[PDB]
Each structure stands twice: as structure tokens, then as C-alpha cells.
Amino acid sequence: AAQKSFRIKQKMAKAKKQNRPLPQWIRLRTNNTIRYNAKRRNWRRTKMNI
């Protein structure tokens, strides 16, 4: 909520910095098997239960 706690604002910040796609220069490395970011998250679909 608005009147929240720092223990939760921390965990929301982490989720904000995690919510991005994959860097395209990872796909150019040699023995690469990562196509996309399979751990993505958005508020519509999956709630992080904290």
C-alpha cells in the first residue's frame, strides 16, 4: 500500500529491476542456449505474494 514498510519496498525495487527483457548481446555468445527471459513478471498476470 502507501503506508508500507521498507522490507517490502526493497522487494518491490528488486522486482522492478528484474522486470526487463533479456540483453540482446547475450544471444551472440558462443555456446548460448538462452533465447528469452523465462522469469518475467507483470502485475496483470502473476502477483508476487509478499
Partner 1 sequence: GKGTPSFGKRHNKSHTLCNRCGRRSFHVQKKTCSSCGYPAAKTRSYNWGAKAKRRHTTGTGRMRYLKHVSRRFKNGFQTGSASK
Partner 2 sequence: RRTITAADRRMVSGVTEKQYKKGMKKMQQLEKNAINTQIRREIKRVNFQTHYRDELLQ
> What residues line the site for partner 2 (CB under 8 A)?
21-25, 27-28, 35-37
Report the C-alpha gap between 12 and 2 in whole angstroms: 13
Report the C-alpha gap between 8 and 24 in whole angstroms: 31
Binder among 7, 25, 29, 46 for RNA (CB under 7 A)? 46
CB atoms within 10 A of CB 41: 13
Scan residues 3-22 and list those touching partner 1 (CB under 8 A): 7
Size of the residue set binding partner 1 (CB under 8 A)? 3
Residues contributing to the site for RNA (CB under 7 A)? 1-4, 8-9, 12, 15-16, 19-21, 33-39, 41-44, 46-50
